[PDB]
Amino acid sequence: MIQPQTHLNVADNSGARELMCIRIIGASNRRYARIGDVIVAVIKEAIPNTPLERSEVIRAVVVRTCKELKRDNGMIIRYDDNAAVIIDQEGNPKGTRIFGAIARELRQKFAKIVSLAPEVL
Amino acid sequence: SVDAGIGVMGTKLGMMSFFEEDGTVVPVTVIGFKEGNIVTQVKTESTDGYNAVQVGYERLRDRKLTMPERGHLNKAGVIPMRHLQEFRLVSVDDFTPSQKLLFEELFKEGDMVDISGTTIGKGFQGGIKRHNFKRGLMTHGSKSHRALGSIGAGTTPGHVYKGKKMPGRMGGTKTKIRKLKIMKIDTDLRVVMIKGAVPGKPGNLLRLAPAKIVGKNIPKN
Amino acid sequence: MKHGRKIHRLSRPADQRRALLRGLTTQLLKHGRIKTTRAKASAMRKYVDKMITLAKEGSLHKRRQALGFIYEKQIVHALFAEVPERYGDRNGGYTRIIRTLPRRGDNAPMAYIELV
Amino acid sequence: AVPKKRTSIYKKRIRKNIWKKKGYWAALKAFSLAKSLSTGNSKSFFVR
Amino acid sequence: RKSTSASTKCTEEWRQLKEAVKKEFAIPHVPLDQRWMFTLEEATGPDIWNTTWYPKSADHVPTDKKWYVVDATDLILGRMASTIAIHIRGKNLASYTPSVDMGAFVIVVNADKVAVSGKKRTQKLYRRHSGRPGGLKEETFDQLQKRIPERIIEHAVRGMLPKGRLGRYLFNHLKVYKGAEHPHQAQQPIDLPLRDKRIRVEK
RNA sequence: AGGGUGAAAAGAACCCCCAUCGGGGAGUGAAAAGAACAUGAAACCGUAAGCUCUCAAGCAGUGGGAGGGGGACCAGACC
RNA sequence: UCGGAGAGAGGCUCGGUGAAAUAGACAUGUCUGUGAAGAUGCGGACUACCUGCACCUGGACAGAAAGACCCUAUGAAGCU
RNA sequence: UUCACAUCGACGGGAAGGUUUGGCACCUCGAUGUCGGCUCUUCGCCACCUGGGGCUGUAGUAUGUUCCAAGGGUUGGGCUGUUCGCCCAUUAAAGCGGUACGUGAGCUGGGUUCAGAACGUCGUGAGACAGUUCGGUCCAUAUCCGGUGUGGGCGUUAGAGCAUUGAGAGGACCUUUCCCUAGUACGAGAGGACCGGGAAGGACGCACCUCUGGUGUACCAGUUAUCGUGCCCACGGUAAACGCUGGGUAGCCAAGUGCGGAGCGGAUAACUGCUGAAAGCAUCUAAGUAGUAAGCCCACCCCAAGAUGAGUGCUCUCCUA
RNA sequence: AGAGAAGGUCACGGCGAGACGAGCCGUUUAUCAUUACGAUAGGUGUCAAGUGGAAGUGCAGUGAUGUAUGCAGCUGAGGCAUCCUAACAGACCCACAGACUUGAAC
Ligand SMILES: [Mg+2]
Ligand SMILES: [Mg+2]
Ligand SMILES: [Mg+2]
Ligand SMILES: [Mg+2]
Ligand SMILES: [Mg+2]
Ligand SMILES: [Mg+2]
Ligand SMILES: [Mg+2]
Ligand SMILES: [Mg+2]
Ligand SMILES: [Mg+2]
Ligand SMILES: [Mg+2]
Ligand SMILES: [Mg+2]
Ligand SMILES: [Mg+2]
Ligand SMILES: [Mg+2]
Ligand SMILES: [Mg+2]
Ligand SMILES: [Mg+2]
Ligand SMILES: [Mg+2]
Ligand SMILES: [Mg+2]
Ligand SMILES: [Mg+2]
Ligand SMILES: [Mg+2]
Ligand SMILES: [Mg+2]
Ligand SMILES: [Mg+2]
Ligand SMILES: [Mg+2]
Ligand SMILES: [Mg+2]
Ligand SMILES: [Mg+2]
Ligand SMILES: [Mg+2]
Ligand SMILES: [Mg+2]
Ligand SMILES: [Mg+2]
Ligand SMILES: [Mg+2]
Ligand SMILES: [Mg+2]
Ligand SMILES: [Mg+2]
Ligand SMILES: [Mg+2]
Ligand SMILES: [Mg+2]
Ligand SMILES: [Mg+2]
Ligand SMILES: [Mg+2]
Ligand SMILES: [Mg+2]
Ligand SMILES: [Mg+2]
Ligand SMILES: [Mg+2]
Ligand SMILES: [Mg+2]
Ligand SMILES: [Mg+2]
Ligand SMILES: [Mg+2]
Ligand SMILES: [Mg+2]
Ligand SMILES: [Mg+2]
Ligand SMILES: [Mg+2]
Ligand SMILES: [Mg+2]
Ligand SMILES: [Mg+2]
Ligand SMILES: [Mg+2]
Ligand SMILES: [Mg+2]
Ligand SMILES: [Mg+2]
Ligand SMILES: [Mg+2]
Ligand SMILES: [Mg+2]
Ligand SMILES: [Mg+2]
Ligand SMILES: [Mg+2]
Ligand SMILES: [Mg+2]
Ligand SMILES: [Mg+2]
Ligand SMILES: [Mg+2]
Ligand SMILES: [Mg+2]
Ligand SMILES: [Mg+2]
Ligand SMILES: [Mg+2]
Ligand SMILES: [Mg+2]
Ligand SMILES: [Mg+2]
Ligand SMILES: [Mg+2]
Ligand SMILES: [Mg+2]
Ligand SMILES: [Mg+2]
Ligand SMILES: [Mg+2]
Ligand SMILES: [Mg+2]
Ligand SMILES: [Mg+2]
Ligand SMILES: [Mg+2]
Ligand SMILES: [Mg+2]
Ligand SMILES: [Mg+2]
Ligand SMILES: [Mg+2]
Ligand SMILES: [Mg+2]
Ligand SMILES: [Mg+2]
Ligand SMILES: [Mg+2]
Ligand SMILES: [Mg+2]
Ligand SMILES: [Mg+2]
Ligand SMILES: [Mg+2]
Ligand SMILES: [Mg+2]
Ligand SMILES: [Mg+2]
Ligand SMILES: [Mg+2]
Ligand SMILES: [Mg+2]
Ligand SMILES: [Mg+2]
Ligand SMILES: [Mg+2]
Ligand SMILES: [Mg+2]
Ligand SMILES: [Mg+2]
Ligand SMILES: [Mg+2]
Ligand SMILES: [Mg+2]
Ligand SMILES: [Mg+2]
Ligand SMILES: [Mg+2]
Ligand SMILES: [Mg+2]
Ligand SMILES: [Mg+2]
Ligand SMILES: [Mg+2]
Ligand SMILES: [Mg+2]
Ligand SMILES: [Mg+2]
Ligand SMILES: [Mg+2]
Ligand SMILES: [Mg+2]
Ligand SMILES: [Mg+2]
Ligand SMILES: [Mg+2]
Ligand SMILES: [Mg+2]
Ligand SMILES: [Mg+2]
């Protein structure tokens, strides 16, 4: 349930420490980013001397919410923080290595991302 | 509003969860039945002007029914019943007064139904709750909050419009929920499980018809 | 709204309504019959029966639970004496409510609640 | 908001008659109640 | 419950006495059919010759009135509706009075064969308005005539009847049917006289 | 700001309703004029009897008057 | 965002007591037209059984007297 | 490039509208008051998107211009007293107008720069400013109409109880990507379709509580201070309308769960047409017809015979003297 | 005029119905013996559910405290049973075979 002005942690190498979400995309006029949605964020805090400068406008996909994802098993999933992964407009992650768990719900639109994951839920 | 096929009536027993082999959980309303669903009366185009069949539903003690009504069900040769309803068909040849309906013969699995019932009465409700009015500002100076807003324009027209949305009574009405699906029929308990919500709390009275699809089940106009 | 909210409010806030009911039941157990408003009566049923059903068992536990409801000890002990005698066979339903002429001052409907 | 005019005699008589009709229903309750206490058979009721 | 107690008995009896004596001395009613200037009785009465004649209750009584039938097939809407209005109103009787109903009943049959000149079939526009804004509805004459064709002639005659109490009460005297058959045979309808030349259209 | 029961307080014994006030009889008086008392208009509040209103749009009247009722002596009139 | 539920004091019903500003008379629809140029009251259509109660505030150029703004007065006063 | 009329259209002309800046002073002065936002509508069409078309300097994709079309839609922020406007990120698109700034007896900022004060400037001066700056009180129990609901009376030609027809009225019929068709037509390539199928979304509507929860002063547990119950134990009161916290069933609720938007139905606008005269040729039109729109009307969903035109149906009841 | 038609209102017990009216359900609570219809509310008994391990008495410990008895104790606005209380007593409205005409039938 990411929405504009929400702050996020980044899940990969890409050298952004923190993102502020400004827009949800592809959802038409929706206000809610949930897992698997592309958001336009900006960089707030960066990891120094990295290809990414703060105050950059970038795309990222939301891989973790504190809201709850519902599969068809009746299974539910809730993380402790919000996080996204910074991508290209191709679906390829800019940074090459991902932290944290992800879901099998991303397997359709993003292959790379499920691949680089340390754990899958 | 000619109705496709005969429907039956039933009682809403409340909802539970229902698994499928692949572990898909569908929430289902469980619709029970009671002694009834008996054809009461039949109305011919000649006699009544149109074609319809009146089914009775709930059984009842004899005393509780009034003399006119009791006489109405004595003409049929049927047991005393609480609720009567009418279904409106295009062809009534298959039905004779006193005939009985079985919901197991009118409804298979994977079939589409339509559930009419009465809604929960929420009483007398404000503009917010009844029409989804946005509420005004809670804090900087503002005295409005849950209030209705302005109700019209200025000197002209100089009166409020008809139908202009206002607080009044909400709920408690005949509602129809189109295109539902029947997950499982239990013969032992004579119950039907339907995917999703139907109106009203348990102990309600429902009407199930086979779904009216505006292209293919109904007269064109 | 309220659907299925079953409690008797008696037009008092929670604290006062509790204390009211404690009071009224110590009165009922002390005098055996009393005159109140129909609302107060209908509300008071439940707690009367709670005390009676309580004293039918008699354990130090139960007795402590009654002492912490009723105001006057003496009445509680009297209960734990009398009840096994007087109510032993009655399975529930220990109160009669016999309604009367309304009150002159406000026209509040009155009633007589009896320990049966 | 005030009364732009003064209410006409007859309309006022109709509104007050409406308020007087509640007396009619009260008199019916009272009568029925009297005929109930006038048999001395009611165990739900008590008078002193 | 009709009380047969001596009281109500008595009262009814007495009232028929009052009525009897009031009937005997009252001036008789002489209907208007070859009604000659005066009966030796009226001659003792009020002055009805030097004042304008106004109809009394015995006259206009509903049960008397003529009935007429208009076959509306190949008639022209308006021109017929004027005739109809005249007869319903009573303007063709010597006894006509503006304040009273002296008129006839008129039965219009074949209300779907009524004819209209020029492009009106597709042009003429029947509008009616909900009373909400944006609440305007419009039909062409033809949509109407396929849907509920009686309303066309009712709507054309009601226009030419007076407006106001007498107007509406008059409007109930117009009985319209779409088929060629009317269930009024008991009332013995006469045919309607039409003195207009242009009222009959020929194709 | 608050005047005028009657000629005279003769200001109502006695009985009834009855905790008092208040009342109804009886008695006083030319009259009840009964003490909030002398003539007692209007607004305003009602009660009874006659006709009449619940498909109706209206500064409420007016000319025409259906039907119904009432007191007449110029009963063809008036209300 | 985008509202939700709850508790109290009112609101609501019943009994007791019981105001006020307001008020030519009011038998007090809508559209359009007209008109001192934004009409319940004039015209034409249209719509409307009688009458309550709870709510809402678009209208009645709603209500609370001199319009603080502008001008007038051979007005008033304070000040330079 | 040729070519006035794909698209522009100079010099001039003829209009409509009444939204800009104005002229007038018919209007109200007592307390008939301007611009922005909030809430809440509603209407117009000169059409921003969505539906159908003609022409193109239209290969395709995408345009350009124009025709019919107002059913629906028309985001969220940084910035301003602002109309205006600028930008950021989106989007199918982020239309322009009317309604006394539409809306102040619904809400709130400025504005009528009210009285305090300061700056610049003008004035000897008191003071002044279509200069700037900080501070600065609008009340309201709804009589009538209008409205949203919800009753009673009476009518409906004997009185009732049920079940319905549907005149009329409303709600809703919205939209985006993606995938087959097919990397097929089209084009040298780069690019890349019409038409018709399939899924997922958005907004909106109708319900609902199985799951995930919110509240839950019904309840359960911890726990601080303190006064009660004779004292320990254990409970009760108070710490407003929970002392403070941690949970919570039923209800109510959404962020949760379902479902909806169907029509080889009818008639049209633009347009495309077929037979075909008046003018032995031609012509979509004069006769007569054929396709065709998110528009119009039925169908869908609720209401509905006070529909006084008061409907139809089934049954019941009308005793005694 | 007696009586009280069918039905209605009131009363009485209620509600997932409700501002009030309105709506809906009840009003002796069955019999059964093979279906179902005769439990409205409260109480009582049991069940789901919540909370999370009662008091008392034992043991361990210098003690705060832990541990056993015990899915305990409290609660149970939800179900299902059972007439134990209250649905007692009752009251009011209400019964011109449906004015008049005309055809048709007999
Ligand atoms: Mg029934
Ligand atoms: Mg409710
Ligand atoms: Mg808001
Ligand atoms: Mg506030
Ligand atoms: Mg109170
Ligand atoms: Mg407290
Ligand atoms: Mg309990
Ligand atoms: Mg005396
Ligand atoms: Mg005393
Ligand atoms: Mg005395
Ligand atoms: Mg005397
Ligand atoms: Mg004397
Ligand atoms: Mg006097
Ligand atoms: Mg009418
Ligand atoms: Mg009438
Ligand atoms: Mg009138
Ligand atoms: Mg709330
Ligand atoms: Mg509250
Ligand atoms: Mg107070
Ligand atoms: Mg009161
Ligand atoms: Mg006064
Ligand atoms: Mg009126
Ligand atoms: Mg003019
Ligand atoms: Mg006008
Ligand atoms: Mg008018
Ligand atoms: Mg007039
Ligand atoms: Mg005139
Ligand atoms: Mg208003
Ligand atoms: Mg208000
Ligand atoms: Mg007006
Ligand atoms: Mg006026
Ligand atoms: Mg001068
Ligand atoms: Mg001077
Ligand atoms: Mg040209
Ligand atoms: Mg002037
Ligand atoms: Mg004013
Ligand atoms: Mg256009
Ligand atoms: Mg287009
Ligand atoms: Mg084009
Ligand atoms: Mg090209
Ligand atoms: Mg449009
Ligand atoms: Mg529109
Ligand atoms: Mg629009
Ligand atoms: Mg598009
Ligand atoms: Mg505005
Ligand atoms: Mg606008
Ligand atoms: Mg206003
Ligand atoms: Mg300021
Ligand atoms: Mg100077
Ligand atoms: Mg300050
Ligand atoms: Mg009022
Ligand atoms: Mg009103
Ligand atoms: Mg009404
Ligand atoms: Mg009614
Ligand atoms: Mg009636
Ligand atoms: Mg009737
Ligand atoms: Mg229906
Ligand atoms: Mg219809
Ligand atoms: Mg109507
Ligand atoms: Mg419609
Ligand atoms: Mg459609
Ligand atoms: Mg190719
Ligand atoms: Mg397609
Ligand atoms: Mg969808
Ligand atoms: Mg839930
Ligand atoms: Mg639940
Ligand atoms: Mg909680
Ligand atoms: Mg909950
Ligand atoms: Mg002590
Ligand atoms: Mg405590
Ligand atoms: Mg204390
Ligand atoms: Mg204190
Ligand atoms: Mg307190
Ligand atoms: Mg808590
Ligand atoms: Mg949903
Ligand atoms: Mg065509
Ligand atoms: Mg062509
Ligand atoms: Mg030719
Ligand atoms: Mg040709
Ligand atoms: Mg043609
Ligand atoms: Mg078509
Ligand atoms: Mg279409
Ligand atoms: Mg479509
Ligand atoms: Mg009817
Ligand atoms: Mg009639
Ligand atoms: Mg009876
Ligand atoms: Mg009732
Ligand atoms: Mg009740
Ligand atoms: Mg009884
Ligand atoms: Mg029970
Ligand atoms: Mg129960
Ligand atoms: Mg223990
Ligand atoms: Mg404890
Ligand atoms: Mg030890
Ligand atoms: Mg448990
Ligand atoms: Mg039993
Ligand atoms: Mg009993
Ligand atoms: Mg007859
Ligand atoms: Mg006869």
Side-chain angles (χ1 to χ4, degrees):
Chain A
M1 214 153 168
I2 331 291
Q3 41 159 260
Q5 308 278 327
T6 318
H7 289 258
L8 295 135
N9 319 323
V10 207
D12 63 307
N13 295 342
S14 48
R17 231 183 140 181
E18 180 168 13
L19 299 201
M20 178 183 78
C21 161
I22 70 188
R23 252 290 145 171
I24 301 82
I25 330 163
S28 334
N29 271 129
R30 196 198 230 137
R31 303 205 177 183
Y32 290 150
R34 42 164 142 240
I35 287 164
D37 285 339
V38 188
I39 78 166
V40 173
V42 328
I43 294 195
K44 284 303 188 180
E45 280 175 0
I47 305 159
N49 281 120
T50 290
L52 284 185
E53 324 198 337
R54 77 165 281 183
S55 304
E56 275 322 297
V57 167
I58 63 182
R59 305 228 161 173
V61 292
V62 191
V63 297
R64 296 206 291 268
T65 51
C66 293
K67 186 65 182 179
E68 301 90 358
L69 196 68
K70 297 190 175 186
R71 282 171 96 192
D72 76 309
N73 312 270
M75 260 186 45
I76 308 194
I77 290 178
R78 155 168 158 82
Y79 304 94
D80 272 347
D81 61 50
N82 311 303
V85 157
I86 307 174
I87 54 164
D88 187 342
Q89 293 181 353
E90 212 66 11
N92 321 315
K94 196 180 174 152
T96 55
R97 153 203 186 194
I98 296 180
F99 310 89
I102 328 218
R104 301 139 190 163
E105 220 84 350
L106 302 201
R107 197 185 164 201
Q108 184 50 37
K109 295 170 212 166
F110 317 90
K112 302 278 187 193
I113 312 203
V114 175
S115 304
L116 302 180
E119 177 147 348
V120 177
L121 311 180
Chain B
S1 93
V2 167
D3 307 333
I6 290 312
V8 295
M9 318 184 57
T11 308
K12 164 164 175 168
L13 303 182
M15 320 195 31
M16 65 175 59
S17 280
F18 178 76
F19 289 85
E20 288 184 354
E21 249 198 342
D22 43 28
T24 311
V25 271
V26 179
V28 283
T29 298
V30 179
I31 298 189
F33 290 72
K34 293 142 131 198
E35 182 186 0
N37 287 108
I38 300 176
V39 169
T40 282
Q41 185 197 32
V42 153
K43 311 175 160 201
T44 309
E45 295 165 11
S46 66
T47 304
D48 219 307
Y50 67 119
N51 274 346
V53 34
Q54 175 174 41
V55 345
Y57 180 67
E58 177 54 14
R59 197 163 175 194
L60 190 72
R61 187 184 176 177
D62 331 343
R63 301 166 71 213
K64 298 184 179 166
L65 203 63
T66 78
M67 279 204 66
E69 293 174 318
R70 191 181 322 146
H72 181 49
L73 307 192
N74 278 354
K75 191 192 177 189
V78 304
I79 53 185
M81 284 170 246
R82 172 116 52 187
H83 316 265
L84 304 197
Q85 280 224 12
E86 263 195 60
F87 297 87
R88 203 189 161 175
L89 323 177
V90 220
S91 306
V92 195
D93 290 326
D94 327 334
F95 307 98
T96 300
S98 177
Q99 170 190 336
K100 192 144 45 190
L101 310 176
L102 308 189
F103 67 103
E104 300 190 345
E105 327 177 338
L106 309 189
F107 296 138
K108 309 177 175 186
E109 224 92 314
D111 282 343
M112 290 305 109
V113 296
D114 218 323
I115 301 298
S116 197
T118 199
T119 311
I120 288 179
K122 258 101 62 207
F124 186 96
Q125 282 312 129
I128 305 282
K129 190 133 176 223
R130 190 173 182 206
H131 298 101
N132 312 109
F133 284 175
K134 303 159 198 171
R135 111 196 159 291
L137 228 186
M138 284 310 105
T139 294
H140 315 256
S142 87
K143 288 179 172 179
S144 66
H145 319 331
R146 305 183 63 79
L148 206 54
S150 158
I151 59 181
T155 281
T156 280
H159 70 101
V160 327
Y161 292 123
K162 283 189 201 294
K164 148 72 201 178
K165 294 180 242 184
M166 268 166 181
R169 189 178 266 177
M170 165 165 179
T173 183
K174 181 198 175 204
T175 281
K176 195 128 119 174
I177 304 178
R178 344 206 315 98
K179 298 205 154 155
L180 290 158
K181 187 186 177 187
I182 305 162
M183 301 288 300
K184 185 189 184 189
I185 302 175
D186 298 0
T187 311
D188 193 339
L189 309 129
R190 281 186 198 159
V191 308
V192 175
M193 299 161 92
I194 282 184
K195 167 179 170 201
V198 298
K201 293 286 210 172
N204 209 181
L205 177 77
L206 298 177
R207 185 182 185 191
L208 358 164
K212 279 166 69 181
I213 289 182
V214 341
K216 318 168 179 181
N217 317 136
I218 318 179
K220 296 188 184 183
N221 293 325
Chain C
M1 340 70 215
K2 41 151 283 196
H3 303 261
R5 269 157 139 267
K6 309 250 208 169
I7 55 159
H8 295 288
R9 276 214 241 183
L10 304 175
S11 309
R12 341 232 161 180
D15 289 338
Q16 304 184 20
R17 120 166 53 84
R18 172 116 185 294
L20 180 77
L21 281 203
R22 321 222 313 186
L24 274 177
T25 73
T26 88
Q27 300 303 334
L28 184 81
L29 305 168
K30 171 163 74 183
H31 296 114
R33 165 192 167 196
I34 54 175
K35 173 160 216 171
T36 49
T37 75
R38 274 177 225 196
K40 294 186 202 176
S42 305
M44 202 185 44
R45 278 185 304 196
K46 162 154 200 165
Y47 293 83
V48 164
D49 296 338
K50 226 173 225 209
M51 290 322 103
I52 280 163
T53 310
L54 215 48
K56 270 186 174 213
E57 308 172 0
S59 70
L60 176 50
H61 191 46
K62 297 311 179 157
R63 175 191 241 90
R64 254 128 124 98
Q65 297 177 39
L67 277 167
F69 188 72
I70 283 145
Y71 286 135
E72 319 249 17
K73 284 181 155 182
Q74 285 309 317
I75 320 191
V76 151
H77 291 126
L79 247 222
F80 280 70
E82 172 196 23
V83 164
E85 172 90 330
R86 195 200 199 182
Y87 296 110
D89 298 328
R90 203 127 169 167
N91 171 59
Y94 315 79
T95 35
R96 223 159 202 68
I97 284 179
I98 295 191
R99 52 171 200 277
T100 48
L101 248 27
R103 183 144 62 185
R104 190 210 128 183
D106 48 24
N107 183 35
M110 286 296 228
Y112 267 105
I113 163 125
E114 299 164 345
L115 199 54
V116 108
Chain D
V2 294
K4 189 84 172 195
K5 267 302 165 130
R6 124 219 229 96
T7 294
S8 56
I9 299 132
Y10 88 68
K11 288 183 191 176
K12 134 201 154 191
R13 243 161 223 168
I14 303 170
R15 276 174 219 147
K16 284 199 201 155
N17 278 354
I18 278 181
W19 180 80
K20 292 181 197 187
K21 212 54 169 188
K22 299 179 161 182
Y24 177 74
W25 305 112
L28 292 198
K29 323 267 173 165
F31 191 65
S32 60
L33 188 65
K35 287 272 187 180
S36 277
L37 313 185
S38 69
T39 192
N41 299 357
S42 291
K43 300 183 174 175
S44 71
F45 219 98
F46 171 81
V47 186
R48 179 172 175 178
Chain E
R1 146 229 187 164
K2 305 309 165 175
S3 174
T4 42
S5 67
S7 49
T8 86
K9 282 183 168 179
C10 186
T11 294
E12 294 148 4
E13 303 168 357
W14 274 115
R15 121 188 158 184
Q16 298 161 12
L17 230 229
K18 300 187 202 169
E19 191 60 19
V21 313
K22 184 191 175 189
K23 274 172 180 169
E24 273 202 6
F25 287 106
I27 313 172
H29 182 62
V30 286
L32 327 145
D33 43 347
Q34 300 186 1
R35 166 224 193 286
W36 194 66
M37 178 62 73
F38 65 98
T39 309
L40 294 197
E41 175 79 359
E42 319 174 305
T44 309
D47 184 330
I48 66 169
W49 304 272
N50 288 115
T51 58
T52 323
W53 179 89
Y54 190 112
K56 280 191 197 176
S57 195
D59 301 336
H60 49 242
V61 299
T63 296
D64 293 9
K65 321 188 151 160
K66 304 290 175 194
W67 289 68
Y68 293 116
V69 268
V70 190
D71 186 9
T73 191
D74 305 338
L75 286 211
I76 305 176
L77 177 71
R79 290 180 178 267
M80 167 214 61
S82 279
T83 313
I84 284 165
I86 293 152
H87 290 238
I88 289 181
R89 175 64 147 131
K91 283 290 222 85
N92 67 338
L93 312 181
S95 43
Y96 161 87
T97 295
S99 68
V100 141
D101 191 326
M102 296 296 295
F105 293 90
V106 172
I107 300 173
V108 169
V109 324
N110 281 324
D112 50 342
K113 311 292 188 38
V114 80
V116 186
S117 69
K119 280 188 187 189
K120 297 199 249 182
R121 209 188 153 195
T122 314
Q123 284 206 8
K124 178 157 192 68
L125 210 46
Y126 286 64
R127 343 202 176 189
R128 32 187 206 72
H129 188 275
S130 152
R132 329 200 169 196
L136 180 64
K137 298 203 170 37
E138 282 178 358
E139 298 209 4
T140 55
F141 177 97
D142 217 328
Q143 306 180 338
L144 231 199
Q145 205 197 8
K146 275 168 187 172
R147 176 191 185 182
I148 36 158
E150 308 80 345
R151 176 176 283 180
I152 261 160
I153 296 201
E154 286 165 349
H155 188 296
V157 173
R158 159 160 50 225
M160 314 187 180
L161 286 192
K163 338 294 174 176
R165 307 203 182 208
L166 194 65
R168 310 191 282 276
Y169 166 78
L170 270 168
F171 170 71
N172 276 345
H173 286 195
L174 174 69
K175 316 268 187 168
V176 163
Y177 297 98
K178 71 157 312 170
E181 298 298 337
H182 61 94
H184 290 329
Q185 334 190 324
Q187 272 68 34
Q188 313 288 344
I190 327 168
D191 310 337
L192 196 67
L194 305 170
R195 68 168 189 189
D196 198 319
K197 297 206 174 194
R198 300 211 154 97
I199 195 175
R200 279 282 316 100
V201 62
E202 301 173 3
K203 292 185 179 181

